[PDB]
Structure 1
Amino acid sequence: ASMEINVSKLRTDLPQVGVQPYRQVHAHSTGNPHSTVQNEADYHWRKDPELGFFSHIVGNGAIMQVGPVDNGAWDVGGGWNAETYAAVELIESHSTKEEFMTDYRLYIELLRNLADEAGLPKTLDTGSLAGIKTAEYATNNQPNNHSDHVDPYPYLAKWGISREQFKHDIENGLTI
Structure 2
Amino acid sequence: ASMEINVSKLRTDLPQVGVQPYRQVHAHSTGNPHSTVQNEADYHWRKDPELGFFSHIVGNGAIMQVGPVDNGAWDVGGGWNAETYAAVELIESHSTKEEFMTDYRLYIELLRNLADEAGLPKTLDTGSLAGIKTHEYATNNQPNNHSDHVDPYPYLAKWGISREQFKHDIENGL
TM bucket by the smaller chain? over 0.9
Question: Cα distance, 1:148 vs. partner?
Answer: 1.1
2: distance between equivalents of 1:92 and 1:55?
Answer: 17
Work out the CA distance in 2 between the residues paired with 1:2 and 1:84: 21
Q: Which runs of 5+ in 1 are unaligned?
A: none
CA RMSD of aligned residues (A): 0.9
Deviations 1:48-78 (A, max 9, x none): 1011100000000000000000000000000
Distance 1:2 1:111 in 2: 12
TM-score, length basis structure 1 = 0.98
1:2, distance to aligned residue in structure 2 (A) = 4.9
**CA–CA distance in 1 between the matches of 2:95 and 2:149?**
23
Distance in 1 separating the partners of 2:73 and 2:12: 12
Match of 2:39 in 1: 39
CA deviation after TM superposition for structure 1 residue 116, in Å: 0.2
Tell me the distance in 1 between the aligned counterparts of 2:27 and 2:2. Answer: 22
| 1:144 Cα deviation from its structure 2 partner | 0.4
Aligned length: 174
Give the drift of 1:3: 1.2
- Which sections of structure 2, spanning at least 5 residues, go unmatched? none
Q: After superposition, what is the alpha-carbon deviation per residue over 1:110-163, rounded to whole angstroms, capped at 9, x for unaligned?
A: 000000000000000000000000000000000000011100000000000000
Q: What whole-Å deviation, never above 9, does each CA across 1:71-103 have from its counterpart, x for those lacking one?
A: 000000000000000000000000000000000
In structure 2, what is the Cα distance between the partners aligned to 1:68 and 1:173?
A: 24
User: Counterpart of 2:82?
Assistant: 82
- Separation (CA, whole Å) in 2 of partners of 1:86 and 1:12: 15
Counterpart Cα distance in 2 of 1:76 and 1:164:
22
Classify the secondary structure of the residue corresponding to 1:31: coil
